[PDB]
Amino acid sequence: DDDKAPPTLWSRVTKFGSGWGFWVSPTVFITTTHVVPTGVKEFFGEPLSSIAIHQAGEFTQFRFSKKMRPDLTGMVLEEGCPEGTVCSVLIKRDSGELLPLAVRMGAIASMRIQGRLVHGQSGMLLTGDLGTIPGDCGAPYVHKRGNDWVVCGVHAAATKSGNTVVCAVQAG
């Protein structure tokens, strides 16, 4: 250790707009809506007409026609995790530092953050700055199930202390 997740899993975390996104598979990319660049004609060199985009409650998913990360296997994307589960936020910093932050997740709810409707899950950063920062949005919340890693949300918000975090999750 001490970075928990394997290099391939870290390599899914991708600088994007004013934050990050996550390659769930070679064709599917997820991120938090407010970090997505606007007024552009393409993402990762691909025209919009070759990308199926779904956005809701601060969760954004891109499905590319073209395989963009064929080095990856497909992962399960779940709608949040069970409450009470200790999950990890896979944070990359601009310096290159990797920071897997442990969080205990609570209830999935509709919240109103800074005027944006967030469909997501609150969680508590666990006692061990220590926490997330404004440039961290889009980092994935993950956990391991059997032998496989699963992703369940993307970083969207945190309270002023930083002790409470929220990930946006995909609606079913």
From Swiss-Prot:
Regulation: Inhibited by the chemical compound K36/GC376, which covalently binds to the nucleophilic cysteine residue. Inhibited by various macrocyclic inhibitors.
Sequence ranges assigned to domain Peptidase C37 in this UniProt record: 5-172
Coiled coil location: none
Catalytic residue list: H34, E58, C137
Domain of life: Viruses
Catalytic activity: Endopeptidase with a preference for cleavage when the P1 position is occupied by Glu-|-Xaa and the P1' position is occupied by Gly-|-Yaa
Subunit text: Homodimer. Monomer; in solution.
Function: Processes the polyprotein. 3CLpro-RdRp is first released by autocleavage, then all other proteins are cleaved. May cleave host polyadenylate-binding protein thereby inhibiting cellular translation.
Name this polypeptide is given: 3C-like protease
Organism lineage string: Viruses, Riboviria, Orthornavirae, Pisuviricota, Pisoniviricetes
Portion of the full-length sequence here: 1101 to 1274 of 1789
